[PDB]
Amino acid sequence: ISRLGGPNFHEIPINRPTCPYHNFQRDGMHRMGIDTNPANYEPNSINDNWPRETPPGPKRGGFESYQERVEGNKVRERSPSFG
Amino acid sequence: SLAPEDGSHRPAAEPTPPGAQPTAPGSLKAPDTRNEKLNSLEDVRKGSENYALTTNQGVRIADDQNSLRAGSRGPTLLEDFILREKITHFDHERIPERIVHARGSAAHGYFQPYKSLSDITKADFLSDPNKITPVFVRFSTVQGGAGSADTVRDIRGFATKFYTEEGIFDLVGNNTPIFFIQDAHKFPDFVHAVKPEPHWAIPQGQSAHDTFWDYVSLQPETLHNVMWAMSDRGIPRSYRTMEGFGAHTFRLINAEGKATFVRFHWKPLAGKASLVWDEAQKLTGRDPDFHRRELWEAIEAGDFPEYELGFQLIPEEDEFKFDFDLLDPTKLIPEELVPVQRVGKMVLNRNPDNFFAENEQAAFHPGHIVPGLDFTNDPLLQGRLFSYTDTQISRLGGPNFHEIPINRPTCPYHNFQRDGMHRMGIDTNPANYEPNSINDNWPRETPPGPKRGGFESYQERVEGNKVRERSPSFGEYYSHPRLFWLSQTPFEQRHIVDGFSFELSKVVRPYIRERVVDQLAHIDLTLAQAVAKNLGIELTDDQLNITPPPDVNGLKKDPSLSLYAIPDGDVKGRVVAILLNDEVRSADLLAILKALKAKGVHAKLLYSRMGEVTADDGTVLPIAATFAGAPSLTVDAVIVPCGNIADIADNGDANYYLMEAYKHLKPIALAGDARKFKATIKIADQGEEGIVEADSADGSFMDELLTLMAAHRVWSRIPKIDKIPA
Amino acid sequence: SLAPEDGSHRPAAEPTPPGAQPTAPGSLKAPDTRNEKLNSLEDVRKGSENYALTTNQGVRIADDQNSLRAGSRGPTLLEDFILREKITHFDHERIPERIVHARGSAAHGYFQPYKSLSDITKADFLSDPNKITPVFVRFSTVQGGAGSADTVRDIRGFATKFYTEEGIFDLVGNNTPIFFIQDAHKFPDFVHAVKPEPHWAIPQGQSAHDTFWDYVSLQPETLHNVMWAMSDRGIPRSYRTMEGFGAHTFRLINAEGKATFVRFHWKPLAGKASLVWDEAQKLTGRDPDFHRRELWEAIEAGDFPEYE
Amino acid sequence: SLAPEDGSHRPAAEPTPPGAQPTAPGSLKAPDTRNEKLNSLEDVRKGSENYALTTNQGVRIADDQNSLRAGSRGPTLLEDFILREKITHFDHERIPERIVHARGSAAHGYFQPYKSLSDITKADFLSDPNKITPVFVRFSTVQGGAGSADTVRDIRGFATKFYTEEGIFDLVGNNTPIFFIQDAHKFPDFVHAVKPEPHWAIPQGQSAHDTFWDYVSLQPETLHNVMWAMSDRGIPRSYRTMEGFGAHTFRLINAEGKATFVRFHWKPLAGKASLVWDEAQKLTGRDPDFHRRELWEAIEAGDFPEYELGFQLIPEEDEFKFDFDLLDPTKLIPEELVPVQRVGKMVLNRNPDNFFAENEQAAFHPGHIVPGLDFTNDPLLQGRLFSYTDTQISRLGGPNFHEIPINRPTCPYHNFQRDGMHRMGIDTNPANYEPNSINDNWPRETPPGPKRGGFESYQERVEGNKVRERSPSFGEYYSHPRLFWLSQTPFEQRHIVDGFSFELSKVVRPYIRERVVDQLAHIDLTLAQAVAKNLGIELTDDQLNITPPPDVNGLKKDPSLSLYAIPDGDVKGRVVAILLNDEVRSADLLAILKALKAKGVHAKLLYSRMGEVTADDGTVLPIAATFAGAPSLTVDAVIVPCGNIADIADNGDANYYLMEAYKHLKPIALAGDARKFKATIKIADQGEEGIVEADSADGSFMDELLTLMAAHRVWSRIPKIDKIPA
Ligand code: HDD
Ligand code: HDD
Ligand code: HDD
């Protein structure tokens, strides 16, 4: 945000994905992308909800975190195993 | 010298009623109103009188009227550094406005508890009733920009910065007790939906557009706060006459480490009061700064905004005792189930000196807590904690925003953080890291404890898998809408109906209005039918047969959800228009002003032109404004004294004054010949409830008037106003 | 599955009168309208239909309804990068507004001269009646913020960006033929005086307050443009029905090097028309976006704003 | 509690020589060293001892070692606001570095004039010999980044901020009296050419690359300042041992309105002294912070850097009396033609507390003048006036950079400018415009006058058409290079030849070398032939025939242009390496150390390891550094005392130490058996000029050594060093 001037850093040419990027994020300093989507939110009916979420799956799926088990209290504590 | 001889350019440094003096920066208006935060700003407060005009570098300017040029008709020269510095600073005056709540109005004050709360919290500002905490409060709308109007239909923000001895605590609330959405991850969706639409940036300060109602219709969790916004809650009379809430369950933590669930409330001591829709909308045109002006002027007048801080307290073992989830920010805790314990009073008693420096640059953040408070797993509050730090990096220019004067703690702050844009503090510590030996490890960590201890989180047990999943216990959307609906008076219900009706009529895509009406039929059929009727929609047989949602823990209603069900009228600081004529009966005016003063009610004397008029006995009456200049939108009641009524009886603007006030349900009083005005507003010869009338403005006439003003508006008048063309 | 079956969510991509259809982005409303500037913007336009929702790094999102937590009633985790990217972009959406003329409405268009003006100027965009120059025009008020009302009493700006074959030419005009003050050095003084007063930031969109009339009373050079502002000029019916002026004398320079003094004018082909004050003021309340709406709807209807 | 119980973590608050104690923030090192600016910074200085560690909001931290997580091996929680604040401030610590002079070292001090200069200028800071003006000075390189090396070959900046009673005056100069180019419009071309090349960002801190010499070869106006940079001027021994110059002709304006043209000078009271190239380049590797460090330690030792401010003054009527144009910043004014008149003395006597806050954020700009000074039409100066204000908007984050504490005037500043990012000042003025009546038009303009008046520009006549045209008076490029060349000693001339030969040898395109050689052939054929020989290039008969450029106003040389032609040696603050052995003759060390102390020369005791050695008589000798740890590059002379020389006679490092010192022309002294080292450096039995040798360090040994030190280097040694492999 300071080093590269704001949240459109992914639009600086070196940083751009070569694959598709589409979402409802808008504006920010030095905005290059001119969005034509009638909708800047979801769920929306006015653009038939596009761009859409994608279920996870074998290939080309949405990102889902591994459902790791978490068990413990809220602590600021170094694990004893690190000592 | 440019000032007038008589010194009438400078407002008196003493409390004065609205309109009596020009308004002024707070330290010049009220220089002996002090608190610890106000005093600690003295290092940066900059005077002006008797100083030479200079550059920012301290160089005296000889001619501040001209650029340097080659010849008096020549080109301007690059070497004119006086011009360029002055133009550079101008060219860079603006900073980004807040993403949301950009429109807001702020004042200094103080808070003091009613009693020690150490049994339930170790928070130092609540440890002793003699503990006085300076505050800075900013009230706001939500959707519109910094240049938008005050009296829109919108949620209002109510943000309080507590400058405590153990840290800044920011209590960042709104005027309804819930929010529109459940999980912080959808905040940009909801905010983009409500904000002006992206192609053309319309509309400002309004939810009355396709994208808001599209989102609402597809996200039934929104309906509870949407009920609030569509009620008269959405259009407060004043920031002084609305409630405030933290919305989220937080925790209090005591010296023994015991946690208690808490929700925060601010109860306005001037009572609850809102406008009516037509009045509010028209007021955004006649005075888009009405709330800002009214707040500044109340403080100038000594009508300090006062609020009682209240806690709803729920023992940790009672976490699952309700039929809604305590962590769901779309559910309120009814006061019938958990009373509000009144804990202290906040008094707002001084305006800022410079709006940009103190108000625009102020940064409030709900993650700014102090030992003795803690958070909960509310998934809306959880994401807030990220945003309010992050946003200041662009808004206030970098990570040193706490060094901006208004944001500084008044208590000590020392740590190993260094640099960043516009670094003010010059650290002398040999060390900028810990642990260090070279400064004997100073500044040092402090163990948590009963007082002056370091912050330690409450060791809440976390058990579950890493999931992006909404709790099933959040999946109920209609029962809280319904409870709120059932708790409103019948006129509050009609206004909610009209709120939805008016908004939906501005939705261009008809299927959206239909889909919203379907959601209403899940809340209450009477409401859904009344809105459908205004929209030219007919409920289907299926819609008529949707079972209503259950009561909330057995509650049929809760009157604490109404603005008006339970009288809490306070007339002090209200205002009345007095409509003058060229020969007022002085005896009328004497009695009016005297009775008003007795109750702390203000007056504005109105006429067809500026200047003065002269009463029957020669009293010179100064005119504050014209009928068109200070519309009835701006006052709580209208009195017409007796006199040469012929003077005004044919004045369209005078007659319209009374039509407008009458339409908007305001008390009207007419004495002696002023009763000829009865005919313009269609009052039967015998009179009616809410029109005070008598031969003269005696003593009973004012008590009648003032009793009406205590009930705020004349709700019984509503069926008559449909006929009046106004 | 969210759009209605009958396709009534989607505006007709053809000229329709105000109120007949929802408004839409220009390239979707009128995909057949083109000019050289609009064509050159194609490399940065982003569509939306049939695309997956992603992060800004191109990662598809599975669930755009929830944060990542430890248990479905648990705390949010710092490793939720999808949440933090999305909230961070939202957190930094705003940029400073214009010091003056913060409130304004804009449209793409084109300009063409009636004949070659080569005898008086070597400016390429004026050299050939066939030469068409794209423009982008922004109309504005002066005093109020970007969120203030359109139909205030104020000066209006009328700024035209001409994308010529020999460079950008910006003609940055107002709707009266003069300004309030003589020397740039005093611009911050006058603008401070008309702007909301610094203790309380009131009033928005209005010169009707003490500091403005103090400055005027002390600076008679201001009266000329004050007359214009106090006239119905200060409350135009539409950006389409006001005049525009460059105010200053500039120069035309021909190929021989001859200089001619020039003042710029725009004449509205829809003619000149203003509100009345009571109407204008009330309208700031009933529809503070009236002029921005009217401009956008005129263009969607094919009532294109034309100026000579 | 981690400090050593003996208190040795804390440096003594008293003057101590280089290496004796750890360095500290100036206010902890020298708390009794005060001036009005240092005193005025007290409001922002932040201490640390005895304070609790907090967030920036003032909340005490209990555990600054851990993030908040779910379980001690679990995931980090978003509600860790303590972690996020601390990482956020870190993540934003950096600000853009200066476009040029990014690498700079700075200190506080004061200035006083010798006598009132009222007859020639009304500048308040020069009006009274008892008026002390605080200053802040930053010295710098030009090309390299803030993290580049100090002892590069480059021009040096010398910028002085005077905190005067009538405003900030910035005298922003360099260590040579001219600049490379004539018109500010070419500054980005010149700077881009010298800076690292844009494809690969190489080289750092060096002009020794193609694009620089390409530009120079195509712009002969550059050649004069290129001569300076190629001489030993480009590699000063210390910021305390170089000259400073404002370069441009400015004006002084007195009370009577008379203008006098002036050029500004700083004379170093410690004399002029430079490194030699091989030493300078190697020192960028062994200690890239050598000048920064040397400045800091001189101040901690009490060897305060002192400079005498001087003026070359030229009456208006003499504007056109020189062979060159006074407004041409590629031309110098020879002191033989116009002497420097002594004006006053500046002493730098305290280091900053925090480098980022005071040094990195300081903003200097030559347009910051004060009444009694004014500019000229010098077309380089004219463009500078635009840049130094503009650049701060990004560098320091907006138009309030003057509110950053180091930048603030100590005198009053008041005006109508408001807002901007980072606004500190809270204005209470009812008015933010003038003329105003509402604050009686305050703050007010001040007419010009003899003292405390407003700034008015000297009403210089302008006559011409609007042109982008170089004055023909500026079209002469060679005579000043030649005057500079002819003014240097023969050894200086050889160093110039070697600087060009070395730099052009790094230029990859040969045609560029050839074009530079051809330009040199226009300056002086001896120079051009000598550089050509080193590059394997043969001058043509045409080149051998170029006629030299004219004398400058009849001067065939001016010795004030040489570093060394007129002796101005000063040993105080210099340093000597003492090479110890494991049984030093203690009588030698007593004699050496006391002789050095009496003249203010420091010593560093060196050995093959750290810890201690023991002398013949049992005295315990603390070792400062190893031979390799503190190489001869870092000292001015080397002394080897007698003792068990066998200990070190076979130590490669010990031997190499003397060979490196020897090659770089430094005085070397050898006592008793240390004379066996004579064989290492190839000294004849009967010895040579620049090697001191005796049976012991008694009698005249130390005087002979100090005499050599006063002459800086052993130039006579030059023909000897070419064959030695070091
Ligand atoms: C995840 C994003 C997010 C979420 C979910 C919320 N907020 Fe917020 N809020 C912001 C992100 C934000 C913000 C963008 O950070 C603001 C505006 C810019 C800033 O300085 O803070 C802000 C400002 C802001 C203000 C104005 C403070 C001021 O006057 O300066 C108030 C009153 C609230 N918030 C209150 C609330 C309430 C009652 C919420 C629901 C319980 C809520 N916020 C949820
Ligand atoms: C020296 C200061 C100054 C002066 C004296 C003027 N302007 Fe200006 N103007 C600015 C400095 C400025 C500015 C602060 O730079 C703005 C605001 C932000 C922007 O982009 O430029 C601007 C914007 C601005 C705009 C809005 C452009 C847009 O839509 O972005 C218009 C129409 C004008 N100006 C027109 C005028 C006219 C007719 C003037 C009288 C002859 C005038 N300006 C004097
Ligand atoms: C028109 C462009 C321009 C030109 C022609 C000059 N400068 Fe400059 N200078 C700048 C534009 C600039 C600047 C880019 O604005 C800098 C770097 C960043 C800063 O704050 O100022 C700067 C920095 C800078 C500094 C560093 C100040 C500090 O320590 O922070 C010094 C000492 C000089 N300059 C001296 C000179 C000299 C002796 C020049 C020739 C006689 C000269 N400048 C010409």
Short mmCIF file of C-alpha atoms in Angstrom, two decimals, chain B residues 167-422:
data_model
loop_
_atom_site.label_atom_id
_atom_site.label_comp_id
_atom_site.label_asym_id
_atom_site.label_seq_id
_atom_site.Cartn_x
_atom_site.Cartn_y
_atom_site.Cartn_z
CA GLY B 167 -5.03 3.57 26.45
CA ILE B 168 -7.44 4.97 23.81
CA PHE B 169 -10.68 3.05 23.81
CA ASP B 170 -12.81 3.63 20.69
CA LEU B 171 -16.44 2.59 20.96
CA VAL B 172 -17.51 2.68 17.31
CA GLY B 173 -21.27 2.33 17.16
CA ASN B 174 -24.38 3.19 15.11
CA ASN B 175 -27.95 4.30 15.94
CA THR B 176 -29.54 0.85 15.56
CA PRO B 177 -28.57 -2.21 17.59
CA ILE B 178 -27.68 -4.54 14.69
CA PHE B 179 -26.07 -4.54 11.34
CA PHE B 180 -27.22 -5.47 7.82
CA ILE B 181 -24.85 -8.38 7.41
CA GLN B 182 -23.40 -11.33 9.23
CA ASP B 183 -19.77 -11.78 8.03
CA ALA B 184 -17.16 -9.10 7.39
CA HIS B 185 -16.25 -10.86 4.14
CA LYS B 186 -19.49 -9.52 2.56
CA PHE B 187 -18.95 -5.88 3.70
CA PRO B 188 -17.68 -4.66 0.27
CA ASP B 189 -20.68 -6.34 -1.39
CA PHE B 190 -23.27 -4.69 0.82
CA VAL B 191 -21.47 -1.33 0.78
CA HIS B 192 -21.07 -1.36 -3.02
CA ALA B 193 -24.81 -2.26 -3.29
CA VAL B 194 -25.93 0.74 -1.12
CA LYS B 195 -23.44 3.27 -2.49
CA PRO B 196 -23.97 5.16 -5.80
CA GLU B 197 -24.07 2.70 -8.70
CA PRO B 198 -20.73 2.27 -10.48
CA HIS B 199 -21.54 3.33 -14.09
CA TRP B 200 -22.90 6.84 -13.31
CA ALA B 201 -22.28 7.39 -9.54
CA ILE B 202 -26.00 7.92 -8.71
CA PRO B 203 -27.62 8.21 -6.15
CA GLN B 204 -25.99 10.13 -3.32
CA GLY B 205 -27.15 9.61 0.26
CA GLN B 206 -29.94 7.17 -0.77
CA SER B 207 -30.63 3.48 -0.61
CA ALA B 208 -33.61 4.13 -2.94
CA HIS B 209 -32.04 2.43 -6.00
CA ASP B 210 -31.95 -0.92 -7.79
CA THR B 211 -28.66 -2.34 -6.50
CA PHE B 212 -29.43 -1.93 -2.74
CA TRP B 213 -32.84 -3.59 -3.02
CA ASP B 214 -31.38 -6.29 -5.37
CA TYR B 215 -28.85 -7.20 -2.66
CA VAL B 216 -31.49 -7.00 0.15
CA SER B 217 -33.84 -9.22 -1.82
CA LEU B 218 -31.10 -11.88 -2.24
CA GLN B 219 -29.75 -11.64 1.29
CA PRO B 220 -32.60 -11.98 3.86
CA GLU B 221 -30.12 -11.49 6.75
CA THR B 222 -30.30 -7.75 5.84
CA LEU B 223 -34.02 -7.40 6.56
CA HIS B 224 -33.74 -6.58 10.27
CA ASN B 225 -31.51 -3.52 9.84
CA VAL B 226 -33.49 -2.62 6.67
CA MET B 227 -36.66 -2.51 8.93
CA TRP B 228 -34.76 -0.03 11.16
CA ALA B 229 -33.62 2.15 8.22
CA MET B 230 -37.20 2.22 6.76
CA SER B 231 -38.61 3.38 10.10
CA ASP B 232 -38.27 6.91 11.40
CA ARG B 233 -35.06 5.63 13.05
CA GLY B 234 -33.52 6.37 9.64
CA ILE B 235 -34.21 10.10 9.91
CA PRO B 236 -33.30 11.44 13.36
CA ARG B 237 -34.32 15.01 14.35
CA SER B 238 -30.91 15.51 15.84
CA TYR B 239 -27.77 13.53 16.77
CA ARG B 240 -28.89 14.58 20.31
CA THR B 241 -32.20 12.65 19.96
CA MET B 242 -31.13 9.16 18.77
CA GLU B 243 -29.83 5.98 20.53
CA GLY B 244 -26.35 4.52 20.01
CA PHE B 245 -25.28 0.89 20.15
CA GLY B 246 -22.01 -1.06 19.78
CA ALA B 247 -24.13 -3.80 18.03
CA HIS B 248 -21.63 -6.63 18.80
CA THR B 249 -21.30 -8.71 21.88
CA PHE B 250 -17.92 -7.85 23.45
CA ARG B 251 -16.53 -9.01 26.85
CA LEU B 252 -15.76 -7.29 30.10
CA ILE B 253 -12.90 -8.93 32.01
CA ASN B 254 -12.41 -8.33 35.78
CA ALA B 255 -9.31 -8.59 37.98
CA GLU B 256 -10.09 -12.25 38.68
CA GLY B 257 -10.23 -12.99 34.94
CA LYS B 258 -13.92 -13.60 34.81
CA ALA B 259 -15.51 -12.75 31.44
CA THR B 260 -19.05 -11.27 31.08
CA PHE B 261 -20.72 -10.75 27.68
CA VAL B 262 -21.73 -7.15 27.13
CA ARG B 263 -23.52 -5.08 24.56
CA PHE B 264 -23.08 -1.29 24.66
CA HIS B 265 -25.86 1.35 24.55
CA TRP B 266 -26.01 5.10 24.60
CA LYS B 267 -29.30 6.47 25.89
CA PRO B 268 -29.91 10.10 24.85
CA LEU B 269 -30.88 12.28 27.74
CA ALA B 270 -32.80 14.66 25.41
CA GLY B 271 -35.04 11.66 24.50
CA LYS B 272 -35.69 10.01 21.13
CA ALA B 273 -37.04 12.05 18.26
CA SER B 274 -37.15 11.76 14.44
CA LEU B 275 -38.32 13.80 11.47
CA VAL B 276 -41.01 12.58 9.00
CA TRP B 277 -39.91 11.57 5.50
CA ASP B 278 -41.21 14.48 3.46
CA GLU B 279 -39.68 16.92 5.99
CA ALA B 280 -36.30 15.16 6.03
CA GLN B 281 -36.09 14.98 2.25
CA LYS B 282 -37.04 18.59 1.78
CA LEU B 283 -34.57 19.56 4.54
CA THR B 284 -31.64 18.02 2.53
CA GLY B 285 -32.41 20.79 -0.03
CA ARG B 286 -33.20 23.72 2.33
CA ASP B 287 -30.26 22.93 4.71
CA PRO B 288 -28.01 20.04 3.87
CA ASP B 289 -25.99 20.90 6.94
CA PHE B 290 -28.91 20.84 9.38
CA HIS B 291 -27.59 18.15 11.81
CA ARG B 292 -24.03 19.55 11.76
CA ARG B 293 -25.34 23.07 12.43
CA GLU B 294 -27.79 21.91 15.14
CA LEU B 295 -25.07 20.01 17.03
CA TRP B 296 -22.56 22.93 16.89
CA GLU B 297 -25.27 25.41 17.95
CA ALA B 298 -26.53 23.23 20.87
CA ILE B 299 -23.07 23.16 22.31
CA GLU B 300 -22.68 26.93 21.72
CA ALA B 301 -25.95 27.47 23.55
CA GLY B 302 -25.10 25.27 26.59
CA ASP B 303 -27.59 22.57 25.47
CA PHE B 304 -24.75 20.00 25.77
CA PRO B 305 -25.61 16.67 24.09
CA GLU B 306 -25.80 14.14 26.98
CA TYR B 307 -25.96 10.36 26.84
CA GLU B 308 -26.04 7.62 29.44
CA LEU B 309 -23.73 4.67 28.71
CA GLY B 310 -25.59 1.40 29.29
CA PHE B 311 -24.53 -2.23 29.44
CA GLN B 312 -26.62 -5.33 28.63
CA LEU B 313 -24.71 -8.02 30.67
CA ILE B 314 -24.98 -11.77 29.99
CA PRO B 315 -23.01 -14.26 32.15
CA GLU B 316 -20.82 -16.59 30.14
CA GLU B 317 -22.97 -19.65 31.17
CA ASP B 318 -25.95 -17.94 29.49
CA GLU B 319 -24.31 -18.00 26.02
CA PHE B 320 -26.94 -20.40 24.65
CA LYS B 321 -29.96 -19.27 26.60
CA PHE B 322 -31.67 -17.38 23.74
CA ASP B 323 -33.28 -18.57 20.55
CA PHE B 324 -30.82 -16.41 18.57
CA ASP B 325 -27.01 -16.56 18.66
CA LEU B 326 -25.36 -13.87 20.84
CA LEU B 327 -22.54 -13.53 18.23
CA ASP B 328 -24.91 -12.77 15.29
CA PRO B 329 -24.75 -8.98 14.65
CA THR B 330 -28.14 -9.11 12.81
CA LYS B 331 -29.95 -10.03 16.14
CA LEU B 332 -30.65 -7.53 18.96
CA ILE B 333 -30.95 -8.48 22.65
CA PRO B 334 -34.40 -7.29 23.71
CA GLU B 335 -34.27 -5.13 26.84
CA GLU B 336 -37.26 -7.12 28.17
CA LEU B 337 -34.96 -10.13 28.31
CA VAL B 338 -31.70 -8.39 29.40
CA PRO B 339 -32.07 -4.90 30.92
CA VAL B 340 -29.68 -2.05 30.15
CA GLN B 341 -27.69 -1.25 33.32
CA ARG B 342 -26.98 2.50 33.31
CA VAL B 343 -23.24 2.92 34.07
CA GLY B 344 -22.20 6.57 33.38
CA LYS B 345 -22.82 9.84 31.55
CA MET B 346 -21.02 11.47 28.60
CA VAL B 347 -21.44 15.28 28.06
CA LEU B 348 -20.37 16.93 24.81
CA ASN B 349 -19.48 20.45 25.73
CA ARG B 350 -17.01 21.95 23.24
CA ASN B 351 -16.81 22.28 19.47
CA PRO B 352 -13.52 21.81 17.57
CA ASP B 353 -11.35 24.73 16.49
CA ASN B 354 -10.65 23.41 13.02
CA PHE B 355 -12.93 20.92 11.36
CA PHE B 356 -10.37 19.36 8.99
CA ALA B 357 -7.59 19.00 11.65
CA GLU B 358 -9.76 17.52 14.44
CA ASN B 359 -12.80 15.99 12.76
CA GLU B 360 -11.73 15.01 9.27
CA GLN B 361 -8.40 13.56 10.45
CA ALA B 362 -9.80 11.72 13.54
CA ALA B 363 -9.35 7.93 13.36
CA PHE B 364 -11.68 5.64 15.34
CA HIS B 365 -11.27 1.86 15.37
CA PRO B 366 -13.19 -0.76 17.38
CA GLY B 367 -10.01 -2.84 17.86
CA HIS B 368 -8.71 0.00 20.08
CA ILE B 369 -9.63 -1.64 23.43
CA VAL B 370 -7.99 -1.42 26.90
CA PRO B 371 -7.30 -4.05 29.55
CA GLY B 372 -10.64 -4.95 31.10
CA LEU B 373 -12.45 -5.33 27.70
CA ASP B 374 -12.11 -8.01 25.04
CA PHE B 375 -13.65 -9.21 21.80
CA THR B 376 -15.82 -12.17 20.82
CA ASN B 377 -16.08 -14.38 17.78
CA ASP B 378 -18.79 -12.28 16.14
CA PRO B 379 -17.64 -12.80 12.47
CA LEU B 380 -18.61 -9.20 11.56
CA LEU B 381 -16.61 -7.71 14.45
CA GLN B 382 -13.69 -10.10 13.66
CA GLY B 383 -13.15 -8.60 10.16
CA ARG B 384 -13.71 -5.02 11.36
CA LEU B 385 -10.53 -5.49 13.44
CA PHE B 386 -8.54 -5.72 10.14
CA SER B 387 -10.15 -2.79 8.32
CA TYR B 388 -9.89 0.16 10.69
CA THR B 389 -6.07 -0.04 10.94
CA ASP B 390 -5.51 -0.80 7.24
CA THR B 391 -7.75 2.03 5.87
CA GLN B 392 -5.72 4.81 7.65
CA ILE B 393 -2.60 4.00 5.69
CA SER B 394 -4.09 5.73 2.63
CA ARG B 395 -6.63 7.95 4.38
CA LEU B 396 -4.09 9.59 6.85
CA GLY B 397 -1.03 9.03 4.85
CA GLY B 398 0.92 6.35 6.72
CA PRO B 399 1.45 4.46 9.91
CA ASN B 400 2.02 7.54 12.14
CA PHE B 401 -1.71 8.57 12.19
CA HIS B 402 -1.69 8.26 16.06
CA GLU B 403 0.70 11.28 16.07
CA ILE B 404 -1.94 13.46 14.44
CA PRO B 405 -2.87 15.61 17.46
CA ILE B 406 -6.53 14.65 17.79
CA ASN B 407 -5.58 10.94 17.72
CA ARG B 408 -2.78 11.07 20.36
CA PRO B 409 -3.29 9.24 23.72
CA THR B 410 -3.05 11.58 26.63
CA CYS B 411 -1.46 8.69 28.58
CA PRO B 412 2.15 7.52 28.00
CA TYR B 413 3.07 5.58 24.82
CA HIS B 414 6.58 4.07 24.31
CA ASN B 415 7.71 1.18 22.09
CA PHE B 416 10.33 0.16 19.49
CA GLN B 417 8.41 1.17 16.31
CA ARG B 418 10.34 3.79 14.23
CA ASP B 419 10.11 5.91 11.02
CA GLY B 420 7.14 5.92 8.65
CA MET B 421 5.94 8.92 6.70
CA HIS B 422 5.75 12.23 8.68
#
